[PDB]
Amino acid sequence: DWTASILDQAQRAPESVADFERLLIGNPNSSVVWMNYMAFQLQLSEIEKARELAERALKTINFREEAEKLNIWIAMLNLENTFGTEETLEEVFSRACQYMDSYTIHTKLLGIYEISEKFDKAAELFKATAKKFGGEKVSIWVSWGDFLISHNEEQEARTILGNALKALPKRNHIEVVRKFAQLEFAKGDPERGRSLFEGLVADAPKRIDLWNVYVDQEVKAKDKKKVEDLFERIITKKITRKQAKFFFNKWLQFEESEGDEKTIEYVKAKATEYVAS
């Protein structure tokens, strides 16, 4: 099952050495066999042998199987994090960035630190990863904001969103703010998400997809009066007839999930007389 989690982070059963070496005869490119073989050795606390197996996998798996290679590198990161030392993990990490996509490897160690609840080490790696890649990747900011909101550091999250804006190209500013806003609804302060969305539609009033994401968040949170205020703001905006049907349909359909047939008629009435205009 140790390999089930490696496969997760990457996005007649064999019971002996001879069994695995026999499996590896016909399946040299299978990272799953190699990881199971590593887990077998790890369950017997045979750490050096597990490490040697990973080295073999790196040389034995066909060089074009980058996905199988990634699994091994993640398996080594996990192995070193759990059974090795700071220095032993650092070497594997630096080596893995050499051979695979460095940002991806950075992302995987972050996920590993979180899983093993080395929160302090996650926070330091976030800072370093955002310094190296933050000018290019919005995901590092979102993931770092996620971390901070999950550890009840709202104000630090605002600071990080500020630094994300200074570092990212202007063309990504709406996206990073939009994902911090969704993060606040999901894990943090919805009032803070509301404020972020307000600023987005304040600056890009014609970005009608933003009005949509915004009302999806308000619906998912189920404050029906804020959902209704938002729906009625939206239809007094620069939208096409095609889009107007969509928002009225979504409005109606939400009220059908609220059991208020007085307002569900209100929408039909007001929807149909919108088409009038």
Structure determined by = X-ray
Q: How far is CA 93 from CA 34, 41, 59, 116, in A?
A: 19, 22, 17, 16
CB 179 within 8 A of CB 195: no
**Cβ(77)–Cβ(69) under 8 Å?**
no
**Structure tokens given for 118:** 């080395």
Distance (Å, whole) CA 45 – CA 174 = 49
Residue 117 tokens, joined: 């609840």
Percent helix, percent strand, percent coil in the chain, to nearest 5: 80, 0, 20
Distance CA 258, CA 179 (A): 27
- Token readout for 72 is 């091994």
Distance CA 100, CA 121 (A): 22
CB atoms within 10 A of CB 211: 25
Tokens coding 35: 């990881």
Residue type at 204 in one-letter notation: A
* DSSP H or E run through 233: helix 224-234
Chain centroid to CA 48: how far?
Answer: 33
Q: Which run of H or E residues covers position 28?
A: none
The answer to whether the Cα torsion of 149, 154, 159, 163 is positive or negative is positive
Angle (CA) 49 51 55, round 5°: 110
Residues 231 and 237: their CA atoms lie apart, in Å, by: 11
Name which of 19, 12, 74, 75 is nearest 42 in CA terms: 75
CA pair distance 76, 66, nearest whole angstrom: 15
Residue spans of beta strands (DSSP E) within the chain = none
How many C-beta neighbours within 10 Å does residue 79 have?
A: 25
Give me the DSSP letters along 166-232: HHS-GGGHHHHHHHHHHHHHHHS-HHHHHHHHHHHHHH-TT-HHHHHHHHHHHHHHT-HHHHHHHHH
What are the residues whose beta carbons fall under 8 Å from the beta carbon of 27, sequence distance 6 or more? 33
Residue type, position 62, single letter: N
Q: Where along the chain do its domains lie?
A: 1-277
In units of Å, what resolution does this entry have? 2.3
Closest CA to 129 of 86, 163, 173, 88: 163
Other Cβ atoms within 10 Å of 7 Cβ, number? 14
Rg over CA atoms, the chain:
25
16: left (phi over 0), alpha (psi -120 to 50) or beta: beta
